[model samples]
Target: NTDGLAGFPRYKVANIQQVQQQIKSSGCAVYFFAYPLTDEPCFLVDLQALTGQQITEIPNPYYGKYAGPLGQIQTIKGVGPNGTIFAFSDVCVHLGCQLPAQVIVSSESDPGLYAKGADLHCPCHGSIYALKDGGVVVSGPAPRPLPIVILDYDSSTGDIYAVGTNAPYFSAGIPRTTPQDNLLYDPRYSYSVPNNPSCSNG
Candidate 1:
């Protein structure tokens, strides 16, 4: 059960991916399930490593407002102490707004200085957040921190696996974590908008 009121639409798994690209961007991997119509994804996954992306609707860890997919692509970047530090995706939990790329880059004083612990500025309403932990340092319309994906690294293959999802749109009473393989395992429930499954019933 998700706090989104509606979870997802039921569908048959088209293709199965044990380890797949969590986001369209690089430096991340998760389980994937190919559906019939939508090419995006239809499974629960976890984060494998410290990765990031510019995408839309993630669950609010504290608020738990959006339990369903409600996000869009805005920008993508990596964070770390020096090399591949700890880059992770940023997003506006409110209305699933994607932040602009320039704002993130400009956060650094281009006067040739190391950018450390700068908050990610959301162009939507000027909500700045700390990139180091995806914590909401500044206040705006956003409800919770940018959700994090559960990631795992395979030493044998040096491959990444996104196994779960973190953060809920509302106060789910606990942290929002779902298995990356949830997409392939969980059943999505769908309803007909028309409410007219058959004309004979009407």
Candidate 2:
């Protein structure tokens, strides 16, 4: 299942310089990276623009499970209006669907509770998740917030590492294992809630 460890720490995933460079170069807030922890995909969301000088911690949905005391929570590590990095499990709590590649900014299409900034949206059934507050379930069929991944950021070497993951990785009863199927990247398994028209004007 989980591969092991109640609270594994110090697993280096990406170099901080490279991660910062990627964030600087990327247009959106959410950035994906493969960590050697459990094969479950994860993300480092840049919340510098949103949180400003104050540090923000999104309350952990799975607080007391495998994450130990103090309860697991997503922390945007940074100073002032820069260097805010928040790591979260990218796997959707609803139906175990992979979350959207990019976080959707507040716009006419998604101007609601999380209008202050961006959020995660499920293309399959329109589940909205607020990144600013522990991946809260903003709307749709999602039962709970996204699991928070414990991260250890080193200031001296400027390296970010994934340590452990909170429990209830996905929904109830789902095996907490690395993705062993093609559903993670297969278009054949993709589906739209609103059916597309067959006829096209070409």
Candidate 3:
């Protein structure tokens, strides 16, 4: 059992330059990630060291909250060390395949550094996500950045927990396309179908 934030292992940096070099050297090891809906520090996952299954579908509240891998939506936008951690919707936006549960390390053709540089490519549409921030790194049919999740890592056991619902901090239950301060709109208003229409739709 690890002993760090959210039961995850915490790193101890003795020498600043050496540690930075170490972090830089490790490159794409599936440890470079941030939590959902937050600006908290990112975590590093030593995928090679893991022994059990790693990837799984996460429940979300963006699209609808009535279904399983189907009705449930997700918003965790970036791919950190754990796997393809997307925001809202259990499936990738492009196609509906579950992301790799384990840290499918980058290919041998690419070194560790280059491997980490690559984004999460969709098996169907080949969409990509930025490792650093989970934003769209390449072109795809998806409309916006991947949703983010809020997290709490334990320093004692080296386990990471999904602490809160995944969402952007500024995404206060509403879409940005909508004008703020619309008295008719609630603070958490989402311009959903059957509720709000797009500006051009009006």
* lDDT tens per residue, model 3, 1-202: 2332232333331222332344356432333332321222233332222213343233333445222322243443223334433222223444434333123444422212123443444455545544333344355554444443334434454344543333232333443231111112333322211111101100
Q: What is candidate 2's TM-score against the reference? A: 0.66
Q: Against the true structure, whose lDDT is highest?
A: 2
Top TM-score model: 2
Sorted on TM-score, best first, the list reads: 2, 1, 3
Q: How many residue pairs clash in each candidate?
A: 48, 0, 52
- Ordered from best to worst lDDT, the candidate numbers read 2, 3, 1
For model 2, state the Cα shift of residue 81 in Å: 10
**Candidate 1 structure, TM-score to reference:** 0.40
Which stretches of candidate 2 lie above 4 Å from their native place?
Answer: 1-5, 36-38, 49-55, 65-67, 70-83, 103-116, 171-202
Off by over 4 Å in 1: 1-90, 101-103, 108-115, 169-202
Comparing 1 with 2 on lDDT, the higher-scoring candidate is 2
CA error at residue 100 for candidate 1, angstroms: 3.2
Clashing pairs in model 2, backbone N/Cα/C closer than 3 A: none
Which 10 consecutive positions of candidate 2 have the poorest summed lDDT?
A: 193-202
- Residue 135 displacement (Å), model 3: 3.4
Model 2 residue 177 CA deviation (Å) reads 12
